[PDB]
Amino acid sequence: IVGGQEAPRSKWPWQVSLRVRDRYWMHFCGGSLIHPQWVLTAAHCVGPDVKDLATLRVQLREQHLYYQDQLLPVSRIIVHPQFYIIQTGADIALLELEEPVNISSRVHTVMLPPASETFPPGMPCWVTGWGDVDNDEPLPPPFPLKQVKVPIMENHICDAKYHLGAYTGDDVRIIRDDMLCAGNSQRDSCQGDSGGPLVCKVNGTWLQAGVVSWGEGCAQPNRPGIYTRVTYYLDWIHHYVPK
Amino acid sequence: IVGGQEAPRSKWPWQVSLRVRDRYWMHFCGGSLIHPQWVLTAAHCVGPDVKDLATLRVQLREQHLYYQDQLLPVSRIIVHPQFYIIQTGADIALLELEEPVNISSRVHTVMLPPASETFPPGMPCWVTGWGDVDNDEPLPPPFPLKQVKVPIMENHICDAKYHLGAYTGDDVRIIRDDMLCAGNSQRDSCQGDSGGPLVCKVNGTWLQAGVVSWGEGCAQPNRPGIYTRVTYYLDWIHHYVPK
Amino acid sequence: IVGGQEAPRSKWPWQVSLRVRDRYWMHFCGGSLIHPQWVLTAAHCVGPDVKDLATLRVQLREQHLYYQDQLLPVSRIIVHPQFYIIQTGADIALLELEEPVNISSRVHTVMLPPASETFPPGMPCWVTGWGDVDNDEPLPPPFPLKQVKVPIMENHICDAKYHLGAYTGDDVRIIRDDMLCAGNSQRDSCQGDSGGPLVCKVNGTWLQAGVVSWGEGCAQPNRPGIYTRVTYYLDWIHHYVPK
Amino acid sequence: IVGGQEAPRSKWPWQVSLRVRDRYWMHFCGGSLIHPQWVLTAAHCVGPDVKDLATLRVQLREQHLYYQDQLLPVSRIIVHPQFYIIQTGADIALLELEEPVNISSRVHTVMLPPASETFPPGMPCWVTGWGDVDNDEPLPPPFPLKQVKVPIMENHICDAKYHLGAYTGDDVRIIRDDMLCAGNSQRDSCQGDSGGPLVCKVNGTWLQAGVVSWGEGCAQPNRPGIYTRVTYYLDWIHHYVPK
Ligand SMILES: *[C@@H]1O[C@H](CO[C@@H]2O[C@@H](C)[C@@H](O)[C@@H](O)[C@@H]2O)[C@@H](O[C@@H]2O[C@H](CO)[C@@H](O)[C@H](O)[C@H]2NC(C)=O)[C@H](O[C@@H]2O[C@@H](C)[C@@H](O)[C@@H](O)[C@@H]2O)[C@H]1NC(C)=O
Ligand SMILES: *[C@@H]1O[C@H](CO[C@@H]2O[C@@H](C)[C@@H](O)[C@@H](O)[C@@H]2O)[C@@H](O[C@@H]2O[C@H](CO)[C@@H](O)[C@H](O)[C@H]2NC(C)=O)[C@H](O[C@@H]2O[C@@H](C)[C@@H](O)[C@@H](O)[C@@H]2O)[C@H]1NC(C)=O
Ligand SMILES: *[C@@H]1O[C@H](CO)[C@@H](O)[C@H](O)[C@H]1NC(C)=O
Ligand SMILES: *[C@@H]1O[C@H](CO)[C@@H](O)[C@H](O)[C@H]1NC(C)=O
Numbered sequence: 001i002v003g004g005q006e007a008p009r010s011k012w013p014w015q016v017s018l019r020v021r022d023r024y025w026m027h028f029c030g031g032s033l034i035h036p037q038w039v040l041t042a043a044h045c046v047g048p049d050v051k052d053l054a055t056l057r058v059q060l061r062e063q064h065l066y067y068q069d070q071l072l073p074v075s076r077i078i079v080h081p082q083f084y085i086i087q088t089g090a091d092i093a094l095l096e097l098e099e100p101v102n103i104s105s106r107v108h109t110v111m112l113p114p115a116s117e118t119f120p121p122g123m124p125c126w127v128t129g130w131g132d133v134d135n136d137e138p139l140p141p142p143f144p145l146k147q148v149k150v151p152i153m154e155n156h157i158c159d160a161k162y163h164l165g166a167y168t169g170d171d172v173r174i175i176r177d178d179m180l181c182a183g184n185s186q187r188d189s190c191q192g193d194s195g196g197p198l199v200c201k202v203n204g205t206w207l208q209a210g211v212v213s214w215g216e217g218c219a220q221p222n223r224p225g226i227y228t229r230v231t232y233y234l235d236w237i238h239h240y241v242p243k
Numbered sequence: 244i245v246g247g248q249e250a251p252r253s254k255w256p257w258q259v260s261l262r263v264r265d266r267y268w269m270h271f272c273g274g275s276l277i278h279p280q281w282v283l284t285a286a287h288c289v290g291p292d293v294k295d296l297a298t299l300r301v302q303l304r305e306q307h308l309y310y311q312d313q314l315l316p317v318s319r320i321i322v323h324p325q326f327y328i329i330q331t332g333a334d335i336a337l338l339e340l341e342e343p344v345n346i347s348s349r350v351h352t353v354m355l356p357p358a359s360e361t362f363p364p365g366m367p368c369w370v371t372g373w374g375d376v377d378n379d380e381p382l383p384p385p386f387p388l389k390q391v392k393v394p395i396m397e398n399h400i401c402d403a404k405y406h407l408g409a410y411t412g413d414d415v416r417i418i419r420d421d422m423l424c425a426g427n428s429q430r431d432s433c434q435g436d437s438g439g440p441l442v443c444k445v446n447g448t449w450l451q452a453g454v455v456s457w458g459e460g461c462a463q464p465n466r467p468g469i470y471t472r473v474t475y476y477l478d479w480i481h482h483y484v485p486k
Numbered sequence: 487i488v489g490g491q492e493a494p495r496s497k498w499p500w501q502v503s504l505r506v507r508d509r510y511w512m513h514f515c516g517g518s519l520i521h522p523q524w525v526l527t528a529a530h531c532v533g534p535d536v537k538d539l540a541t542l543r544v545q546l547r548e549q550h551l552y553y554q555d556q557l558l559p560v561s562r563i564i565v566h567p568q569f570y571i572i573q574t575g576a577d578i579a580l581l582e583l584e585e586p587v588n589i590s591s592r593v594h595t596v597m598l599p600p601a602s603e604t605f606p607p608g609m610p611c612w613v614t615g616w617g618d619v620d621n622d623e624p625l626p627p628p629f630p631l632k633q634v635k636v637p638i639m640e641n642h643i644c645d646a647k648y649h650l651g652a653y654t655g656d657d658v659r660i661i662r663d664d665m666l667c668a669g670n671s672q673r674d675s676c677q678g679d680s681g682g683p684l685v686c687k688v689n690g691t692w693l694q695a696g697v698v699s700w701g702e703g704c705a706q707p708n709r710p711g712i713y714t715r716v717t718y719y720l721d722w723i724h725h726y727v728p729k
Numbered sequence: 730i731v732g733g734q735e736a737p738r739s740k741w742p743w744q745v746s747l748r749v750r751d752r753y754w755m756h757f758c759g760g761s762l763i764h765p766q767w768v769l770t771a772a773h774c775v776g777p778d779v780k781d782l783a784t785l786r787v788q789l790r791e792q793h794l795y796y797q798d799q800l801l802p803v804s805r806i807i808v809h810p811q812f813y814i815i816q817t818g819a820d821i822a823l824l825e826l827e828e829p830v831n832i833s834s835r836v837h838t839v840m841l842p843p844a845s846e847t848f849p850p851g852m853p854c855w856v857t858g859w860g861d862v863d864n865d866e867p868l869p870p871p872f873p874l875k876q877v878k879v880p881i882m883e884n885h886i887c888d889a890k891y892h893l894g895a896y897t898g899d900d901v902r903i904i905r906d907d908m909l910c911a912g913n914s915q916r917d918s919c920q921g922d923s924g925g926p927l928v929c930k931v932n933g934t935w936l937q938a939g940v941v942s943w944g945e946g947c948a949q950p951n952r953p954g955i956y957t958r959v960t961y962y963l964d965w966i967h968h969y970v971p972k
Contacts, residue, residue, distance in 0.1 A: 309871040
């Protein structure tokens with residue numbers, strides 16, 4: 001997370017950390033609890049190949065990464081079938097936990113947006129995670145969970161921005177409809193934040209607008225952060241996660 | 244180049260090295276001389292942003308990188324307009340040299356294939372470059388140009404290979420018509436070889452079949468190297484490069 | 487610490503961590519509380535030059551590095567005058583704290599040995615720290631304080647071991663009287679442990695026998711860990727630290 | 730080499746490069762040809778343990794490292810017996826080649842100094858090598874042999890300099906009689922230059938005064954480069970190398 005501050009302990013009860021077995025259970029991506037037994041994340045977090053499930057764990061909300069771990073094994077990994085190597089469309093996946101977690105004030109699910117919510121410019125949104133605090137600048141120990149308020153940029157304007165200083169034809173769409181843009185050159189998500197949540201407060205309720213996916217650099221001029229647009233994948237999510 | 248040998252001085256007179264101004268004019272990609280004044284390379288080599296031409300130079304055929312350099316300036320870069328960030332299609336670009344090179348037996352152009360050549364399995368083809376000799380293993384000093392014979396894999400067979408061990412739907416195409424596959428778990432191109440040529444000996448004549456583009460790993464089982472298919476872009480190339 | 491286990495919370499109340507101002511107060515050496523206002527460490531830890539004390543902090547016994555830090559500034563540093571660069575004798579120093587720490591069962595001083603104690607082979611001794619767990623292998627997050635029992639090796643036996651496979655003449659002493667040897671190819675201290683304590687249980691009382699100093703590799707065959715012998719410098723220590 | 734310039738091809742016909750087998754024959758230190766069959770270098774270059782000779786090679790003078798290598802195997806390694814791990818005295822070693830080398834104007838021996846030559850301040854001296862051009866800044870390809878003129882600092886003055894900003898007792902000698910000091914904050918040898926020659930022109934003749942050994946940093950204020958004083962070891966050298 002670039003340009004943000006440490007999250008208060010009572011915020012983002014749905015934030016999770018994905019861990020891979022490598023000398024220790026190392027964080028590699030974020031995710032969000034969307035049901036007592038399901039985690040939402042990015043397809044590229046669990047790629048490029050089908051993973052041996054024994055090598056992965058999920059950690060529910062922690063103010064400081066690694067310090068009070070209670071790691072949870074995963075029962076199944078479901079990656080959107082339209083997703084493939086070196087491309088950013090359909091960057092979404094689900095992790096079914098072996099067990100349903102206890103829901104509480106400190107740990108609980110985030111609501112998915114209704115299909116009609118477009119999350120227009122001006123909407124108040126925050127992206128959270130334990131990722132880099134700047135390009136190639138990792139979050140220092142004790143690894144506090146960070147948050148940053150990011151401005152939403154309308155898709156067409158965002159697509160135009162991505163064409164500035166690029167070789168791509170004006171009529172070639174970089175930012176697609178299953179994507180959402182947020183951030184500026186001072187506030188953004190970054191490497192290490194992938195798969196985590198972009199949430200917006202709509203009429204007093206927190207809704208998950210996006211999943212951290214990609215961007216050119218982090219907080220780079222004319223390059224807003226790109227998120228998988230959750231509303232676009234609600235039917236797919238609903239095939240697996242119960243109401 | 245993975246699994247090859249150092250190239251004889253008399254081979255591959257069209258091979259070029261692209262250089263970026265660092266603490267030295269460091270090699271970052273390959274290319275091929277297809278006209279006395281034009282170099283063919285990969286779009287991602289001169290990406291992601293429009294380049295300041297002052298930071299780039301071209302080095303024509305030399306046996307060892309950096310030793311007997313004679314760097315040439317670039318007057319123009321043309322990247323296929325369909326090309327954009329974090330996607331692999333249309334990975335092709337042209338570099339116009341400031342001056343046409345003096346053609347000799349040691350340095351000359353490579354012939355482009357006729358639109359009808361498909362380069363089917365069994366065709367003898369070589370890929371050349373100064374790239375990594377293994378995953379994360381750079382070419383050691385004195386940086387000899389290397390070559391390796393790589394087996395062609397038919398596109399659909401190759402597409403199926405890339406679905407092995409992947410979450411991608413069988414109906415979702417990974418390998419496209421503007422791509423060509425070559426290489427196996429013993430012989431392949433790698434990071435540092437991008438933009439360079441894959442040439443095949445077709446009934447007595449060398450024809451450039453592809454441009455090193457991407458792959459999962461280098462010489463990784465079931466993941467052949469992927470090249471931009473030259474015949475697919477002949478019309479685009481001929482729009483800029485004279486007869 | 488190579489070959490040990492995480493230490494119980496009730497153990498080693500005298501252990502301290504020395505911190506340097508980087509992007510965070512990063513751990514670089516260990517030390518021991520030998521008086522409520524004095525920390526004992528290795529001279530090379532506070533070298534090569536006279537330090538700007540604004541760049542250093544002391545952290546008393548904590549179970550995990552960086553988590554519940556309560557950093558203390560250093561009033562002054564006193565390095566043994568016989569110590570100099572690229573030489574390993576007289577590797578010992580004292581850090582005076584601004585004020586005395588509150589002594590409790592979880593944080594208290596370690597007893598220094600009486601001048602006559604030689605700590606011969608067979609003595610049960612432990613070395614503790616947050617250093618590397620193998621050669622070039624840092625302690626993984628959450629950075630638990632580790633401990634390992636290390637076997638003592640008599641000095642001359644140790645001196646002979648260091649001549650094995652070395653060009654040094656047999657009459658040239660490598661291990662000196664102000665040094666103590668401990669550890670084997672399974673258990674040892676390592677980089678990051680320097681300045682920390684080697685304590686032995688003597689007739690029911692823990693006494694600090696040495697200060698982690700140097701060695702060839704960590705847990706390397708025929709290369710036991712080398713420690714500054716505390717009894718050798720009691721007079722120098724008592725010149726600053728009250729009884 | 731810090732400061733200075735690339736050497737004319739006609740200078741330093743005695744410079745050699747020591748290579749270790751590591752993916753390629755990698756340069757790790759310099760040396761000097763002091764007899765058609767003997768190379769003089771630093772003991773620490775061939776430490777810390779007795780080396781398997783199959784892993785070492787010597788390369789005679791070449792303008793650019795790695796490019797026109799003609800590697801030579803070593804028959805014997807003789808390290809001064811007073812030298813030992815982590816200490817800087819007696820930093821001198823000899824390598825006997827399997828065969829005598831051909832002597833020419835471009836490749837020949839450097840003369841050793843008479844025992845009476847003290848190389849006092851004011852003497853014109855140059856240090857040469859392929860090492861770092863600044864702290865942690867390696868020589869870039871094509872790796873030209875570099876040279877720099879360095880001023881001699883009298884031993885006592887030098888010893889006093891090394892006490893400036895250090896904790897060492899004024900009466901504790903850092904710079905010893907078997908050492909020689911040369912260089913300043915603008916001109917110096919560095920990592921990668923060890924074992925190479927410091928030569929001074931005396932009454933029109935080049936004599937090897939020192940062997941690159943150590944220093945605090947490279948070209949660091951109040952820290953001249955420290956060399957093994959060749960005259961101090963003439964008897965030892967003469968026990969093995971024919972006059
Ligand atoms: C799920 O929550 C159960 C109930 O926890 C208690 O009530 C909650 C509302 C909350 O206030 C919590 O802090 C309370 O502890 C847990 O069971 C309880 O576990 C504690 C020990 O951690 C034990 O002292 C209680 O007797 C026990 N009560 C019950 C209803 O059994 C679950 O813990 C698991 O089940 C326990 C029986 C035990 O096997 C423990 O090791 C298990 O983790 C909570 N489950 C999880 C996944 O944490
Ligand atoms: C040692 O030098 C011999 C003579 O070198 C030649 O004369 C010099 C004055 C100079 O002009 C130099 O450039 C010349 O090459 C070498 O022998 C010569 O080697 C060359 C091939 O390298 C050959 O064509 C010559 O006929 C031959 N002449 C003689 C007098 O033998 C030595 O080379 C080695 O020995 C050779 C016989 C051959 O086996 C070659 O492969 C060897 O390298 C030089 N020795 C070394 C170790 O370099
Ligand atoms: C928010 O609430 C107001 C008042 O109830 C309503 O008019 C508006 O449409 C609501 N917006 C959304 C996105 O539900
Ligand atoms: C250099 O030459 C001069 C004049 O011949 C002589 O006096 C001086 O001592 C010589 N120095 C050496 C080292 O020979």
